[PDB]
Paper text:
The proximal (C1) carboxylate group forms a two-pronged ion-pair with the guanidino moiety of R169, a key characteristic of a DctP family [name] ligand interaction, further interacting with the ε-amino group of K94, the amide –NH2 of N209 and an ordered water molecule.
Here, we demonstrate that a genetically linked tripartite ATP-independent periplasmic ([name]) transporter ([name]-pa0886), which is homologous to the known C4-dicarboxylate-binding [name] system, is essential for growth on itaconate, but not for the closely related C4-dicarboxylate succinate. Using tryptophan fluorescence spectroscopy, we demonstrate that the substrate-binding protein ([name]), IctP ([name]), binds itaconate but still retains higher affinity for the related C4-dicarboxylates. The structures of IctP bound to itaconate (1.80 Å) and succinate (1.75 Å) revealed an enclosed ligand-binding pocket with ion pairing interactions with the ligand carboxylates. Together, these data suggest that this transporter, which we name [name], has duplicated from a canonical C4-dicarboxylate transporter, and its evolution towards itaconate specificity enables this pathogen to now access a key metabolite for persistence in the host.
Residue numbers in the entry: 25 to 329
The structure:
Amino acid sequence: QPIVIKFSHVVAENTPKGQGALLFKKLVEQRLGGRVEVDVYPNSSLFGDGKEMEALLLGDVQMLAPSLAKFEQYTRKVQIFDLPFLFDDIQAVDRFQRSPQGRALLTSMQGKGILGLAYWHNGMKQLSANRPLLEPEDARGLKFRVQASDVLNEQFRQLRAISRKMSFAEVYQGLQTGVVNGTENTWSNYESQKVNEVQKYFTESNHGLVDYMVITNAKFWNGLPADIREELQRIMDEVTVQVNLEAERLNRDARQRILASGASEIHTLSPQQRADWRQAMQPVWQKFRGNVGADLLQAAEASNR
Ligand SMILES: C=C(CC(=O)O)C(=O)O
């Protein structure tokens, strides 16, 4: 009789998405009277990148919240969120997500059996490496780990660097062993996974973002009793507010803990240095302009107002 919802993810528990998954479980327990139960599998403990979606389509899991950079095998529209320097900050991405177009992207993969339920924020991305990254030319010849995204692969190729798509669980070992010597991520991801132990230099570039689309199997979700589906959506909407609030503070704490370690430095780009990094990376947009389309790019650019 109880409907079971298995929510798998790849991040540590002490994170926006980690706390969000646990909060969803808690609120379902406190409000659904045992009619729904939620199991949460963090840190790739059940499924890591890629495999998670294969499992979602098979029904081995009922809920995921993957980075918006990881949907190119289902749609090419969500690639917009990966374009470097498109969004000035999370407030901008939030505006885009709220737009009619941003809301419609939650159904962009419905024909493949994937239903989006919400956007969760994590934060802006920074750059890391074993050498200082002050000017774009510093990235040349480095090997950067990226999420499984052609946009992100091309971003570093544009900087004359090598890109290596790797699952999130593999980043630490990849950097520790030299398979990669740098990467990009939020302060939360870096500190939660202790990647600062293997990256001496960080650059607060805010050159992109890590945000998530909470997703489910359309067949499973659309097959739930209406009253339960609606209540679960209402809970999810409350959980979204909480995740979005904790994301900001968790990212600030993570930065402080990295700076306090003494084993890693952080360089903050001047507005002009940032413009130069933007100038060097923005050419990549031309490669995806066709996939995303002029309207989405217009809406995203308008979100910076
Ligand atoms: C974005 C991530 C992980 C995530 O926060 O879900 C990554 O870099 O693979």
